[PDB]
């Protein structure tokens, strides 16, 4: 297209903590990151004879 849509993606943010014998494991989280936009121009020349 003339202008290209931004990318999107999710992630996982789990971190490994030390686990003592009776610890409740602590859950992770996700975030959404999105990329930038880009567009394409048109160029042209010519001749006449």
């Amino acid at each position: 297209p003339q202008v290209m849509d931004a990318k999107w993606a999710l992630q996982g943010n789990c971190v490994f903590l030390e686990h003592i014998e009776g610890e409740e494991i602590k859950f992770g989280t996700i975030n959404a990151e999105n990329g930038p936009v880009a567009r394409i121009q048109t160029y042209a020349t010519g001749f006449e004879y």
């Binding site: 003592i20 610890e23 859950f27 990329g35 930038p36």
Partner: protein, 125 residues
């Protein structure tokens, strides 16, 4: 992250619950020590210490609100079934005296001949 290869926008989305909360990690102070599978009150949390620990060591308290078995009662008092049971931090013993003592459970099975009781840990309000 730092030094990305391109401009970007991160939309953090929240997540409140982090763990089921059946146990808590607590630091032992200078005068505190623990033995495995025994009741303690450390940092305002009462529960069964799952590991031995000394000062500066990390131990985990089981606070599941399950039915627990204990013998660390004051023997002079009777513990009938259903009596509210309190923790005396000075004596480090379960009592029904209450007064300034913390409320910690409710007796399910009364004091047998061996001074053993069963009680249900309360949610630590």
């Amino acid at each position: 992250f730092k030094g990305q290869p391109t401009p970007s926008t991160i939309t953090q989305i929240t997540r409140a619950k982090i763990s089921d909360g059946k146990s808590v990690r607590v630091i032992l102070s200078e005068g505190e020590s623990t033995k495995t599978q025994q009741f303690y009150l450390i940092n305002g949390f009462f529960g069964v210490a799952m590991q031995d620990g000394e000062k500066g060591d990390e131990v985990t308290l089981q606070i599941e609100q399950a039915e627990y078995e204990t013998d660390n009662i004051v023997t002079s008092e009777a513990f009938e079934a259903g009596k509210l049971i309190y923790w005396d931090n000075t004596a480090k013993k379960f009592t029904t005296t209450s007064a300034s003592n913390r409320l910690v459970g409710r007796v399910t099975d009364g004091k047998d001949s061996n001074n053993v009781i069963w009680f249900i840990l309360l949610p630590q309000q």
